Amino acid sequence: EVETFAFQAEIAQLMSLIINTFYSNKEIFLRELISNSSDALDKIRYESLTDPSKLDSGKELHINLIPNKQDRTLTIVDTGIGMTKADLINNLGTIAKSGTKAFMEALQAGADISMIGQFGVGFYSAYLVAEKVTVITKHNDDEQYAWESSAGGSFTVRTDTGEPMGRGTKVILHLKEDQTEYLEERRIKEIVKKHSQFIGYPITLFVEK
Ligand SMILES: S=C(NCCc1ccccn1)N[C@@H]1C[C@@H]2CC[C@H]1C2
Numbered sequence: 001e002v003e004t005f006a007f008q009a010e011i012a013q014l015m016s017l018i019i020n021t022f023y024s025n026k027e028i029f030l031r032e033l034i035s036n037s038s039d040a041l042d043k044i045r046y047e048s049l050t051d052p053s054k055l056d057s058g059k060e061l062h063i064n065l066i067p068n069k070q071d072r073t074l075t076i077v078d079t080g081i082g083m084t085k086a087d088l089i090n091n092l093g094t095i096a097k098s099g100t101k102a103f104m105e106a107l108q109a110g111a112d113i114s115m116i117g118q119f120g121v122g123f124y125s126a127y128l129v130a131e132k133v134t135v136i137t138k139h140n141d142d143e144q145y146a147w148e149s150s151a152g153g154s155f156t157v158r159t160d161t162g163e164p165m166g167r168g169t170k171v172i173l174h175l176k177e178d179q180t181e182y183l184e185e186r187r188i189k190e191i192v193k194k195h196s197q198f199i200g201y202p203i204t205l206f207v208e209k
Pocket residue numbers: 035036039083087088089092093096120121122123124135147
């Protein structure tokens with residue numbers, strides 16, 4: 001059973017801008033998603049200091065990068081705090097409204113797309129390289145859910161029936177046909193070394209066989 005929602009008007013305009021603007025420095029999408037993963041790992045690690053039982057769903061705090069050339073997908077996995085159903089539908093888009101609005105004003109004040117993380121909406125930079133983004137997430141306080149959008153103004157949320165994650169978030173990027181360079185190992189390594197050398201959690205690049 002699937003539910004379809006409309007994006008916030010501001011969010012929908014940001015995604016249409018991100019998709020339709022000719023912007024060449026697309027590699028910043030990885031820094032933003034890794035930075036989001038780092039924040040999610042910070043939150044569960046902090047909460048576990050006063051409640052060690054929050055880690056019963058998994059003690060490992062790490063980020064995995066998993067390219068897949070046959071499926072043309074790049075997947076970013078973290079074992080952070082994860083997201084509830086309310087996060088996916090209401091709360092996170094509500095926090096992001098002021099940031100989205102401010103980000104689009106700045107885009108005419110001279111600022112460029114690479115400053116998206118300074119407004120707390122770096123996640124949507126995934127649509128620089130992805131035609132479709134699937135998010136699998138599991139919070140200690142909710143069930144496992146699957147969020148998905150190909151932009152166009154709508155997204156879906158459903159209960160996920162697949163392999164249980166335990167805890168964390170899996171961002172699955174269905175890459176555009178001309179963006180397969182981000183499925184290459186030395187390209188991913190160069191981007192991580194350039195943008196995310198100072199992340200306080202292990203970032204493991206899964207090499208294909
Ligand atoms: S509101 C949003 N990103 C911005 C919030 C944020 C800021 C800093 C770190 C982490 N998260 N993303 C939401 C999560 C699912 C994917 C799209 C929607 C549903």
